[PDB]
């Protein structure tokens, strides 16, 4: 809940709060001031929402304190990296954070690729916000993945924010490690060797590795 005060107001929003209510009026379209540095470990799950706002901001934004977002579901910090890349906005992957170089909204790239969400509710809904002002209509693959936290998000986007949404089709186990067993002298190594040559893959004697690993 600290997102409103510690992110949006620095970004140029008029954030008014009471004890039990939060109202946010955003600044004129595409004039969001970038934030030089923000610690977001208290708002670990809200960095994706911050990232898309930074992508449309005036200047370079830097989010930190989100090491735990790598093994959360997908590599979320790298997900935002190369999904925003499709809008032509480069990010950088920091030790426990993400740097995002903002772009004027009118000259964003058209993500013809389509936005893959990694089946991550957070990723789908964050790019949902960006696609509100995009100069080109954005396709979001995996609509239904919002279900994890908010099934009716698309409903509310349509009902309250009056956003036109449309249905479209999605326009988009080999190489397993082989184990060889039996006993020494059986032709085990020769079969291994043959396979290595045939599949262009590395043979590894598990006895020899046990010797090298142990010393």
């Amino acid at each position: 809940a600290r997102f409103a005060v510690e992110v949006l107001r620095p970004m140029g929003c008029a954030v008014e709060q009471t004890a039990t209510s939060t109202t946010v009026t955003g600044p004129p379209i595409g004039t969001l001031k970038a934030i030089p540095h923000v610690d977001m470990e208290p708002m670990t799950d809200a960095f994706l929402t911050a990232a898309v706002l930074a992508a449309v901001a005036d200047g370079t934004t830097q989010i930190t304190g989100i090491a735990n977002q790598r093994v959360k579901e997908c590599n979320r910090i790298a997900a935002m990296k190369d999904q925003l890349a499709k809008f032509g906005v480069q990010c950088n992957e920091l030790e426990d954070g993400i740097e995002v170089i903002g772009k004027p909204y009118q000259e964003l790239r058209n993500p013809v690729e389509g936005i893959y969400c990694y089946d991550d509710h957070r990723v789908a809904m964050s790019h949902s916000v960006l696609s509100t002002i995009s100069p080109h209509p954005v396709l979001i693959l995996e609509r239904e993945c919002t279900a994890k936290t908010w099934p009716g998000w698309w409903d509310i986007l349509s009902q309250f924010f009056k956003v036109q949404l449309d249905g479209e089709e999605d326009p988009t186990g080999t190489d397993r490690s082989i184990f060889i067993v039996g006993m020494r002298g059986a032709g085990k190594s020769t079969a291994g060797r043959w396979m290595s040559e045939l599949l262009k893959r590395p043979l590894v004697d598990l006895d020899a590795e046990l010797e090298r690993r142990e010393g």
């Binding site: 080999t174 032709g187 599949l199």
Partner: peptide, 21 residues
């Protein structure tokens, strides 16, 4: 004298299948 040979067509056909190729 299996060790001195290079992979026969017999075994190659076998490997091709089990490796999903």
């Amino acid at each position: 004298s299996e060790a001195l040979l290079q992979p026969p067509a017999d075994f190659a056909r076998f490997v091709k299948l089990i490796a999903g190729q």
